[PDB]
């Protein structure tokens, strides 16, 4: 497919 | 005030919206807006403070810019060439080579030649009379070019302030370094200029899709926190990069046995790393690109064509055992004829390239493909005889449980050495007692993505919740549950290795 | 996504 | 007893009868032959429950006689069965095989030996013009000892009188141009066997042989991308040796074959290119230098991939361990033309045994290719320059045991040590007490890819 | 061509 854009994603959590 | 000056979005008044959409189909970006924007429009300087103070050595190698296009719009192509001319020190540009890949547009023929001959940098127009891929067009354009460094750019790009000196300086520091700018986003709706982050680099997933991914901590520690130093990127996007011409020849250029369906970006990334070179995102170099949601052109020969040829060629030449992670999720790819890879195997032999495991361990330890794992296959319940199935669902959605079809694909999981339950770039995640088992971006930080598979008890225990994976309930029958561990046969799971 | 076919 | 055990000239037409198949008018299909195994193989009793063999056999051949050669001389309990387009009168339905006590027809499209060879017996390939006591048990016993063991002693059956003559167990190789050739079994093979000739010989190359079917499949059979022009023997020998198996001339097994001088039915070096590019490594050049590097040899991807799957060793391991007496030297100091400094001409063999080497204008275009080897020989193909008298330069079969020894990179003189004389200008070079002249100086440069 | 026959040059072992 087309090259993906570097879109901002959801924040990942660092601890549970 | 001028449309788009300084990266400003161009909003089309509603009176014209309809016509805009029609004009949008030609290039799969807002052409009506692009034609209001000046071919020499100003853009912001987006470099990190600290790249602006850098002084780069003199006698930097001149570059030939190769721009290949198929049915590019007049405004985008010309804006690209003007962006390289106006924002490049004149003595650092040998030429611009525009490779016309059998374009069917009036303005891309004689008008293009007339316009380009009036530029103060020599701009040549080379013509592929037969529709040829990007690989073939780039090989033509590079064979024609004279500059010691070859810079490849798409025909819908805009260089920014200070984009070229960093790349040429990195190459002069080491001729076996292949360098990519930070690829900024040029909106396909408004052509607004948006800077890309220096904390994002290139990798791939089990599907062999190129993917953007966060720069990991090891790469900040290597640079001791200095974001202005280049990043070692596992893969390149492919649209934009620079390479010494002689080194481009020495590493085997592109795989000429590949078809038109792409994949060369991953192939050349693997080849550059495994065969002794370095691939880098030069964080002081920015160049914008009109990312699109689909291509505006068809490929010759209709639809339903055999695809994944090039993925098979690259996987069979470079990926070693790990090719399986691709094949197992792509039912049927193992019967597609991938042509003759003899020259490529021999090239790997000549250069004594390292194994793909060395690449996973040293270049891409944060890879989506696990370098070590305990199991690869279906996750079957002992009681209900069903299998976990990702159901093609995206991040934050629930993993399902359905009848095992044994065809691989979306019922393939891996219990990895990091003790994740992973399916491509998603991991099983529980963030609530008795909560749903969701699929989130794997973060390599264990925690709620940590599971324990007891090989004798066959239990899948979510560690942080301390609950075991169990069969679906009557209220949510197509989804596994997590419940206090009971010792039941519904809480036992078979995590066996599927082979060929 | 891969080939579904089945229920 | 026609031919039982020689056929005399039928003088006062044979010319016609012989060239059609390239005599044999009274020879019985149930002919008597001598028992040719060495005494000491007859004392050997070979194990029981030996794997049964399927014998694979035909192209415009009387010889039938070959089928009886297996039938009459095979323990019935060791043969499971006997298995190309033949467009002739007798080469049709003419019934006979249905009357044999052993189960014995495929054919359509004219196909090569590979395609024709590509059965129910657990193990044997044989030509359609072959014919000896106790021949099978040795082969099958060595196979049972190791299923990864791959040849009988091939006796000569005269193509002129059909007289049977046994071949030596002390002959087992190939030369530049990748031709298979017979060569003496070297000393190392006798020292390994401590003098016992009845133990099989480990042969660097093959030309008929037997192999377990499952191991035959494990190694990828023959290269199916090859044409009909031969070469598969070196390919399969190299594959068997490099990829972990064993190939042997089993000296207690004798089987006769009518070696011929020519066949009744362009550059056809495709299969040679495939073989060299898959198995020969750096060494492929020794072929290329004497023959054109543009013959299209098709796709070898599957073959490199098989070499990857079976974890085969390099051709250097083969040259050093299996064929150290190879015609191709594993190491050499020079490969190219031998040019005189004074006359600017080059040595040229003009293509055999005992002949004088010539010297003609260097053309740089085969017959002017020589190699100064690590063994300090001056060799061209399967010949080495040899001088046997103070003051002619002849070409003798290389023997790998030092008057073929020559010695100077700074003086560029080629000193024959045993003669103490240098090679010099004359249609033949001379040998003369070394004088230091430019007529005795020679350029031994490396031809480059 | 046809396979070479196993028939013997007389070879010498020492000069
Ligand atoms: C499902 O399929 C997968 C993939 O095939 C299987 O995983 C493989 O399992 C084998 C067997 O355990 C693994 O091979 C073992 O690797 C261990 C760790 O490797 C070390 O060394 C390498 C060197 O490159 C390092 O890269 C790595 O980081 C480790 O440091 C070794 O400990 C093993 O060696 C053991 O045996 C030898 C003798 O045989 C001893 O000398 C050693 O000291 C040691 O005791 C062995 O080499 C292989 O790595 C696994 N592949 C992976 C993880 O990707 C699964 O087992 C299979 N599942 C089931 C249920 O069968
Ligand atoms: C891009 O190029 C055009 C053409 O050279 C520039 O247009 C100039 O604009 C200024 C400001 O109105 C005028 O004074 C000049 O006379 C114009 N030149 C011409 C040839 O018309 C434009 O300014 C440039 N864009 C920039 C520098 O951002
Ligand atoms: O058959 C083709 C298809 C595309 N391209 C060019 O190759 C570049 C990359 O293609 P595209 O921009 O459509 O892909 P994307 O950047 O969205 O991944 C573009 O400059 C295209 O014009 C080409 O030369 N021949
Ligand atoms: O098109 C062909 C060419 C050759 N052969 C077989 O190849 C074998 C070897 O040929 P030949 O006997 O002439 O070689 P030689 O033993 O004389 O060296 C023979 O059994 C032929 O039957 C075949 O079946 N089809
Ligand atoms: C096959 C061969 O000849 N290899 C040699 C190698 O052994 C030697 O070390 C090198 C230096 O001259 O030259 C080459
Ligand atoms: C010729 O080439 C061989 C192969 O590398 C090499 O070993 C030898 O030294 C060369 N001879 C020269 C340079 O005289
Ligand atoms: C942090 O919280 C999210 C849910 O909001 C995920 O469970 C994620 O896995 C957590 N991160 C760690 C390391 O446990
Ligand atoms: C096909 O897609 C569906 C999702 O709707 C399921 O994941 C199914 O398991 C898939 N079948 C495969 C990949 O074989
Ligand atoms: C052995 O004799 C022949 C000549 O009759 C060869 O020339 C050979 O070189 C001689 N010398 C040996 C074998 O060392
Ligand atoms: Mn693009
Ligand atoms: Mn024959």
Author numbering:
A (entry chain D): 1 to 16
B (entry chain A): 56 to 555
C (entry chain H): 10 to 16
D (entry chain B): 57 to 61, 64 to 70, 74 to 83, 88 to 122, 124 to 127, 130 to 131, 133 to 152, 156 to 166, ...
E (entry chain F): 1 to 8, 10 to 16
Paper's wording?
A conserved family of N-acetylgalactosaminyl-transferases (GalNAc-Ts) initiate mucin-type O-glycosylation by catalyzing GalNAc transfer from uridine 5′-diphosphate (UDP)–GalNAc to a Thr/Ser on a protein to form Thr/Ser–O-GalNAc. GalNAc-Ts are Golgi-anchored type II membrane proteins containing two luminal domains that are important for activity, including an N-terminal Mn2+-dependent catalytic domain that adopts a glycosyltransferase family A (GT-A) fold. The lectin domain consists of three homologous repeats (α, β, and γ), where α and β, but not γ, have GalNAc-binding potential. The isoenzyme GalNAc-T1 is highly expressed in most tissue types and influences many biological pathways, including salivary gland function, heart development, immune system function, and viral infectivity.
To further validate our biochemical data, we attempted to crystallize both human and mouse GalNAc-T1 (98% identity overall, and 99% identity in the lectin domain) with various glycopeptide substrates but were only able to obtain crystals and an x-ray crystal structure of mouse GalNAc-T1 in complex with Muc5AC-13, UDP, and Mn2+ (Muc5AC-13: GTT3PSPVPTTSTT13GalNAcSAP) to 2.3-Å resolution. The asymmetric unit contains a dimer with one GalNAc-T1–Mn2+–UDP–(Muc5AC-13)2 complex (A) having well-resolved electron density and one GalNAc-T1–Mn2+–UDP–(Muc5AC-13)1 complex (B) with poor electron density. The analysis centers on complex A, where GalNAc-T1 is bound to two Muc5AC-13 glycopeptides, one via the α repeat and the other via the β repeat. The Muc5AC-13 glycopeptide interacting with the β repeat GalNAc binding pocket via Thr13–O-GalNAc correctly positions the acceptor Thr3 into the active site for catalysis. However, the 2Fobs-Fcalc electron density for peptide residues beyond Thr10 is not clear and does not provide evidence that the α repeat correctly positions this glycopeptide into the active site for catalysis. Asp444, His460, and Asn465 are involved in hydrogen bonding to GalNAc in the α repeat, while residues Asp484, His498, and Asn503 participate in hydrogen bonds with GalNAc in the β repeat. β repeat GalNAc-T1 residue Lys496 makes hydrogen bonds with peptide residues Thr9 and Thr10 and a backbone carbonyl in β-bound Muc5AC-13. Glu450 in α repeat of GalNAc-T1 interacts with Lys496 in the β repeat and Thr10 in the β-bound Mu5AC-13, suggesting the presence of intra-lectin domain communications. In addition, Glu450 in the α repeat interacts with Lys496 in the β repeat and Thr10 in the β-bound Muc5AC-13. These interactions can mediate communication between the repeats and further support the observations that Thr–O-GalNAc binding in the β repeat could have long-range effects on GalNAc binding in the α repeat and vice versa.
